[PDB]
């Protein structure tokens, strides 16, 4: 039992606002590990974003992410410029697709 099964290196200079959120959230004690669980993501996003208004030009970025058991209630949410947020979320999902639900992935912001 290590805290994680494999590791993702997030490319902060490619997606600087989303990388700063993930880094600030991990530095504040939010989990650095994503226990992937895709089926519950819509439920978790309802819980993480409850009561947080939308903002024109920005997306509500979550860390931990909705596709992680660690997401949902208590997640960090930041307004992130939409091009940055959406590019980052697509990058992350693309890189995590090789891992089945239940895999624990440590995120390191590079």
Short mmCIF file of N, CA and C in Angstrom, two decimals:
data_model
loop_
_atom_site.label_atom_id
_atom_site.label_comp_id
_atom_site.label_asym_id
_atom_site.label_seq_id
_atom_site.Cartn_x
_atom_site.Cartn_y
_atom_site.Cartn_z
N UNK A 1 0.81 -1.23 0.00
CA UNK A 1 0.00 0.00 0.00
C UNK A 1 0.85 1.29 0.00
N UNK A 2 1.27 1.78 -1.21
CA UNK A 2 1.58 3.23 -1.50
C UNK A 2 0.28 4.01 -1.66
N UNK A 3 0.34 5.33 -1.49
CA UNK A 3 -0.86 6.17 -1.56
C UNK A 3 -1.40 6.14 -2.99
N UNK A 4 -0.67 5.61 -3.98
CA UNK A 4 -1.04 5.78 -5.40
C UNK A 4 -0.46 4.62 -6.21
N UNK A 5 -1.04 4.42 -7.38
CA UNK A 5 -0.67 3.35 -8.33
C UNK A 5 0.24 3.87 -9.45
N UNK A 6 0.03 5.11 -9.88
CA UNK A 6 0.79 5.72 -10.98
C UNK A 6 0.69 7.24 -10.84
N UNK A 7 1.39 7.93 -11.72
CA UNK A 7 1.64 9.37 -11.58
C UNK A 7 1.37 10.06 -12.91
N UNK A 8 0.74 11.22 -12.82
CA UNK A 8 0.46 12.17 -13.93
C UNK A 8 1.27 13.44 -13.64
N UNK A 9 1.95 13.97 -14.63
CA UNK A 9 2.70 15.24 -14.54
C UNK A 9 1.88 16.27 -15.29
N UNK A 10 1.33 17.21 -14.57
CA UNK A 10 0.47 18.24 -15.21
C UNK A 10 1.36 19.31 -15.79
N UNK A 11 1.16 19.71 -17.08
CA UNK A 11 2.04 20.67 -17.74
C UNK A 11 1.58 22.12 -17.49
N UNK A 12 2.03 22.69 -16.39
CA UNK A 12 1.52 24.00 -15.93
C UNK A 12 1.75 25.05 -17.01
N UNK A 13 2.89 25.07 -17.70
CA UNK A 13 3.13 26.19 -18.62
C UNK A 13 2.16 26.13 -19.81
N UNK A 14 1.62 24.96 -20.14
CA UNK A 14 0.60 24.80 -21.19
C UNK A 14 -0.77 25.32 -20.74
N UNK A 15 -1.09 25.13 -19.47
CA UNK A 15 -2.40 25.51 -18.90
C UNK A 15 -2.14 26.19 -17.57
N UNK A 16 -1.63 27.43 -17.62
CA UNK A 16 -1.09 28.01 -16.40
C UNK A 16 -2.11 28.30 -15.30
N UNK A 17 -3.32 28.73 -15.69
CA UNK A 17 -4.31 29.05 -14.66
C UNK A 17 -4.79 27.76 -13.99
N UNK A 18 -5.07 26.72 -14.76
CA UNK A 18 -5.53 25.46 -14.16
C UNK A 18 -4.37 24.85 -13.34
N UNK A 19 -3.15 24.94 -13.87
CA UNK A 19 -2.01 24.42 -13.10
C UNK A 19 -1.83 25.14 -11.77
N UNK A 20 -2.01 26.46 -11.76
CA UNK A 20 -1.89 27.23 -10.51
C UNK A 20 -2.98 26.79 -9.54
N UNK A 21 -4.21 26.55 -10.05
CA UNK A 21 -5.26 26.08 -9.14
C UNK A 21 -4.86 24.72 -8.52
N UNK A 22 -4.52 23.77 -9.36
CA UNK A 22 -4.17 22.44 -8.83
C UNK A 22 -3.02 22.56 -7.80
N UNK A 23 -2.00 23.33 -8.16
CA UNK A 23 -0.84 23.50 -7.26
C UNK A 23 -1.26 24.19 -5.96
N UNK A 24 -2.01 25.28 -6.04
CA UNK A 24 -2.45 25.96 -4.81
C UNK A 24 -3.33 25.01 -3.97
N UNK A 25 -4.20 24.22 -4.60
CA UNK A 25 -5.11 23.36 -3.84
C UNK A 25 -4.31 22.26 -3.15
N UNK A 26 -3.38 21.65 -3.87
CA UNK A 26 -2.53 20.59 -3.25
C UNK A 26 -1.69 21.18 -2.12
N UNK A 27 -1.13 22.36 -2.32
CA UNK A 27 -0.33 23.02 -1.27
C UNK A 27 -1.20 23.32 -0.05
N UNK A 28 -2.50 23.51 -0.23
CA UNK A 28 -3.46 23.76 0.87
C UNK A 28 -4.00 22.47 1.50
N UNK A 29 -3.59 21.32 1.01
CA UNK A 29 -3.98 20.07 1.67
C UNK A 29 -5.08 19.31 0.96
N UNK A 30 -5.65 19.84 -0.13
CA UNK A 30 -6.57 19.00 -0.92
C UNK A 30 -5.78 17.80 -1.45
N UNK A 31 -6.44 16.68 -1.65
CA UNK A 31 -5.71 15.45 -2.05
C UNK A 31 -4.93 15.66 -3.35
N UNK A 32 -3.71 15.13 -3.36
CA UNK A 32 -2.86 15.05 -4.55
C UNK A 32 -3.14 13.78 -5.34
N UNK A 33 -3.98 12.89 -4.82
CA UNK A 33 -4.32 11.61 -5.47
C UNK A 33 -5.77 11.66 -5.95
N UNK A 34 -5.94 11.18 -7.17
CA UNK A 34 -7.27 10.98 -7.79
C UNK A 34 -7.51 9.49 -7.86
N UNK A 35 -8.47 9.02 -7.11
CA UNK A 35 -8.96 7.62 -7.20
C UNK A 35 -10.05 7.67 -8.25
N UNK A 36 -9.73 7.26 -9.47
CA UNK A 36 -10.62 7.52 -10.63
C UNK A 36 -11.94 6.80 -10.43
N UNK A 37 -13.02 7.52 -10.66
CA UNK A 37 -14.36 6.91 -10.54
C UNK A 37 -15.27 7.73 -11.45
N UNK A 38 -15.43 7.27 -12.68
CA UNK A 38 -16.06 8.10 -13.73
C UNK A 38 -17.59 8.15 -13.54
N UNK A 39 -18.23 7.08 -13.03
CA UNK A 39 -19.72 7.02 -13.05
C UNK A 39 -20.33 8.08 -12.15
N UNK A 40 -19.65 8.45 -11.07
CA UNK A 40 -20.17 9.42 -10.10
C UNK A 40 -19.83 10.86 -10.43
N UNK A 41 -19.22 11.15 -11.57
CA UNK A 41 -18.71 12.51 -11.82
C UNK A 41 -19.85 13.53 -11.87
N UNK A 42 -20.97 13.21 -12.51
CA UNK A 42 -22.04 14.23 -12.60
C UNK A 42 -22.57 14.57 -11.21
N UNK A 43 -22.71 13.57 -10.34
CA UNK A 43 -23.15 13.78 -8.95
C UNK A 43 -22.13 14.67 -8.22
N UNK A 44 -20.85 14.30 -8.32
CA UNK A 44 -19.82 15.07 -7.60
C UNK A 44 -19.78 16.50 -8.06
N UNK A 45 -19.96 16.75 -9.35
CA UNK A 45 -19.91 18.16 -9.83
C UNK A 45 -21.10 18.93 -9.26
N UNK A 46 -22.25 18.30 -9.15
CA UNK A 46 -23.40 19.01 -8.52
C UNK A 46 -23.02 19.43 -7.11
N UNK A 47 -22.35 18.55 -6.37
CA UNK A 47 -22.00 18.80 -4.97
C UNK A 47 -20.90 19.87 -4.90
N UNK A 48 -19.85 19.78 -5.72
CA UNK A 48 -18.74 20.76 -5.61
C UNK A 48 -19.16 22.15 -6.02
N UNK A 49 -20.09 22.25 -6.98
CA UNK A 49 -20.40 23.56 -7.57
C UNK A 49 -21.68 24.17 -6.95
N UNK A 50 -22.32 23.46 -6.01
CA UNK A 50 -23.58 23.95 -5.39
C UNK A 50 -23.40 25.39 -4.90
N UNK A 51 -24.28 26.30 -5.34
CA UNK A 51 -24.29 27.67 -4.83
C UNK A 51 -23.23 28.56 -5.41
N UNK A 52 -22.40 28.06 -6.35
CA UNK A 52 -21.34 28.90 -6.95
C UNK A 52 -21.84 29.41 -8.29
N UNK A 53 -22.04 30.74 -8.42
CA UNK A 53 -22.54 31.26 -9.68
C UNK A 53 -21.58 31.02 -10.84
N UNK A 54 -22.09 30.85 -12.04
CA UNK A 54 -21.30 30.97 -13.27
C UNK A 54 -20.76 32.40 -13.42
N UNK A 55 -19.72 32.52 -14.24
CA UNK A 55 -19.09 33.81 -14.54
C UNK A 55 -18.79 33.86 -16.03
N UNK A 56 -19.23 34.91 -16.76
CA UNK A 56 -18.91 34.98 -18.18
C UNK A 56 -17.38 35.00 -18.44
N UNK A 57 -16.91 34.16 -19.38
CA UNK A 57 -15.49 34.09 -19.75
C UNK A 57 -14.71 33.04 -18.97
N UNK A 58 -15.33 32.46 -17.96
CA UNK A 58 -14.62 31.59 -17.00
C UNK A 58 -15.42 30.31 -16.82
N UNK A 59 -14.68 29.25 -16.49
CA UNK A 59 -15.26 27.98 -16.06
C UNK A 59 -14.96 27.78 -14.58
N UNK A 60 -15.82 27.04 -13.90
CA UNK A 60 -15.63 26.69 -12.48
C UNK A 60 -14.76 25.45 -12.41
N UNK A 61 -13.47 25.62 -12.19
CA UNK A 61 -12.50 24.50 -12.17
C UNK A 61 -12.51 23.85 -10.79
N UNK A 62 -12.54 22.52 -10.75
CA UNK A 62 -12.61 21.78 -9.47
C UNK A 62 -11.29 21.05 -9.20
N UNK A 63 -10.83 21.11 -7.97
CA UNK A 63 -9.74 20.21 -7.53
C UNK A 63 -10.04 19.83 -6.08
N UNK A 64 -10.18 18.54 -5.73
CA UNK A 64 -10.08 17.40 -6.63
C UNK A 64 -11.19 17.40 -7.69
N UNK A 65 -10.91 16.71 -8.77
CA UNK A 65 -11.81 16.65 -9.92
C UNK A 65 -13.02 15.76 -9.68
N UNK A 66 -14.11 16.06 -10.44
CA UNK A 66 -15.37 15.33 -10.28
C UNK A 66 -15.22 13.85 -10.61
N UNK A 67 -14.27 13.50 -11.48
CA UNK A 67 -14.03 12.09 -11.87
C UNK A 67 -13.15 11.34 -10.86
N UNK A 68 -12.95 11.92 -9.67
CA UNK A 68 -12.18 11.31 -8.60
C UNK A 68 -13.08 11.11 -7.38
N UNK A 69 -12.89 10.02 -6.65
CA UNK A 69 -13.63 9.82 -5.39
C UNK A 69 -13.40 10.99 -4.44
N UNK A 70 -12.24 11.62 -4.50
CA UNK A 70 -11.87 12.71 -3.60
C UNK A 70 -12.61 14.01 -3.94
N UNK A 71 -13.26 14.09 -5.10
CA UNK A 71 -13.99 15.29 -5.51
C UNK A 71 -15.33 15.38 -4.83
N UNK A 72 -16.14 16.29 -5.33
CA UNK A 72 -17.47 16.54 -4.75
C UNK A 72 -17.40 17.53 -3.60
N UNK A 73 -18.05 17.17 -2.50
CA UNK A 73 -18.10 18.02 -1.29
C UNK A 73 -16.71 18.45 -0.87
N UNK A 74 -16.56 19.74 -0.63
CA UNK A 74 -15.29 20.26 -0.11
C UNK A 74 -14.26 20.56 -1.17
N UNK A 75 -14.51 20.26 -2.45
CA UNK A 75 -13.49 20.50 -3.47
C UNK A 75 -13.20 21.99 -3.60
N UNK A 76 -11.96 22.30 -3.93
CA UNK A 76 -11.58 23.68 -4.32
C UNK A 76 -12.21 24.01 -5.67
N UNK A 77 -12.77 25.22 -5.76
CA UNK A 77 -13.35 25.68 -7.04
C UNK A 77 -12.82 27.08 -7.34
N UNK A 78 -12.27 27.26 -8.54
CA UNK A 78 -11.68 28.53 -8.95
C UNK A 78 -12.29 28.91 -10.31
N UNK A 79 -12.56 30.20 -10.49
CA UNK A 79 -12.84 30.70 -11.84
C UNK A 79 -11.56 30.74 -12.68
N UNK A 80 -11.55 29.94 -13.74
CA UNK A 80 -10.39 29.81 -14.63
C UNK A 80 -10.83 30.21 -16.04
N UNK A 81 -10.01 31.03 -16.72
CA UNK A 81 -10.35 31.44 -18.10
C UNK A 81 -10.75 30.20 -18.89
N UNK A 82 -11.84 30.27 -19.64
CA UNK A 82 -12.41 29.03 -20.23
C UNK A 82 -11.43 28.30 -21.16
N UNK A 83 -10.65 28.98 -22.01
CA UNK A 83 -9.75 28.26 -22.95
C UNK A 83 -8.73 27.41 -22.17
N UNK A 84 -8.22 27.97 -21.09
CA UNK A 84 -7.22 27.30 -20.21
C UNK A 84 -7.91 26.11 -19.54
N UNK A 85 -9.05 26.35 -18.92
CA UNK A 85 -9.75 25.33 -18.12
C UNK A 85 -10.14 24.17 -19.03
N UNK A 86 -10.70 24.47 -20.19
CA UNK A 86 -11.21 23.40 -21.05
C UNK A 86 -10.06 22.64 -21.69
N UNK A 87 -8.98 23.32 -22.07
CA UNK A 87 -7.80 22.63 -22.62
C UNK A 87 -7.21 21.71 -21.57
N UNK A 88 -7.13 22.19 -20.33
CA UNK A 88 -6.53 21.39 -19.24
C UNK A 88 -7.41 20.18 -18.97
N UNK A 89 -8.71 20.37 -18.87
CA UNK A 89 -9.58 19.23 -18.56
C UNK A 89 -9.52 18.19 -19.65
N UNK A 90 -9.42 18.63 -20.90
CA UNK A 90 -9.29 17.65 -22.00
C UNK A 90 -7.93 16.94 -21.92
N UNK A 91 -6.87 17.66 -21.63
CA UNK A 91 -5.54 17.04 -21.49
C UNK A 91 -5.59 15.97 -20.40
N UNK A 92 -6.14 16.33 -19.25
CA UNK A 92 -6.17 15.39 -18.12
C UNK A 92 -6.99 14.15 -18.48
N UNK A 93 -8.18 14.35 -19.04
CA UNK A 93 -8.99 13.18 -19.36
C UNK A 93 -8.31 12.28 -20.37
N UNK A 94 -7.65 12.87 -21.35
CA UNK A 94 -6.90 12.13 -22.38
C UNK A 94 -5.81 11.28 -21.72
N UNK A 95 -5.11 11.86 -20.78
CA UNK A 95 -3.96 11.17 -20.13
C UNK A 95 -4.46 10.13 -19.15
N UNK A 96 -5.63 10.31 -18.56
CA UNK A 96 -6.16 9.34 -17.60
C UNK A 96 -6.93 8.19 -18.25
N UNK A 97 -7.17 8.26 -19.56
CA UNK A 97 -8.05 7.23 -20.14
C UNK A 97 -7.43 5.84 -20.07
N UNK A 98 -6.09 5.75 -20.01
CA UNK A 98 -5.47 4.43 -19.93
C UNK A 98 -5.73 3.76 -18.59
N UNK A 99 -6.21 4.47 -17.60
CA UNK A 99 -6.36 3.92 -16.24
C UNK A 99 -7.81 3.58 -15.96
N UNK A 100 -8.09 2.34 -15.63
CA UNK A 100 -9.45 1.92 -15.25
C UNK A 100 -9.90 2.60 -13.98
N UNK A 101 -11.21 2.74 -13.84
CA UNK A 101 -11.79 3.16 -12.55
C UNK A 101 -11.17 2.35 -11.40
N UNK A 102 -10.88 3.05 -10.32
CA UNK A 102 -10.28 2.47 -9.11
C UNK A 102 -8.79 2.72 -9.04
N UNK A 103 -8.17 3.06 -10.14
CA UNK A 103 -6.73 3.38 -10.14
C UNK A 103 -6.52 4.67 -9.40
N UNK A 104 -5.50 4.73 -8.57
CA UNK A 104 -5.13 5.93 -7.80
C UNK A 104 -3.97 6.63 -8.49
N UNK A 105 -4.19 7.85 -8.95
CA UNK A 105 -3.17 8.60 -9.70
C UNK A 105 -2.72 9.81 -8.89
N UNK A 106 -1.43 9.85 -8.59
CA UNK A 106 -0.80 11.03 -7.98
C UNK A 106 -0.57 12.09 -9.06
N UNK A 107 -1.04 13.30 -8.78
CA UNK A 107 -0.76 14.46 -9.67
C UNK A 107 0.42 15.25 -9.14
N UNK A 108 1.35 15.52 -10.03
CA UNK A 108 2.48 16.43 -9.75
C UNK A 108 2.37 17.58 -10.76
N UNK A 109 2.38 18.79 -10.26
CA UNK A 109 2.32 19.95 -11.16
C UNK A 109 3.75 20.31 -11.54
N UNK A 110 4.06 20.21 -12.82
CA UNK A 110 5.40 20.50 -13.33
C UNK A 110 5.42 21.88 -13.97
#
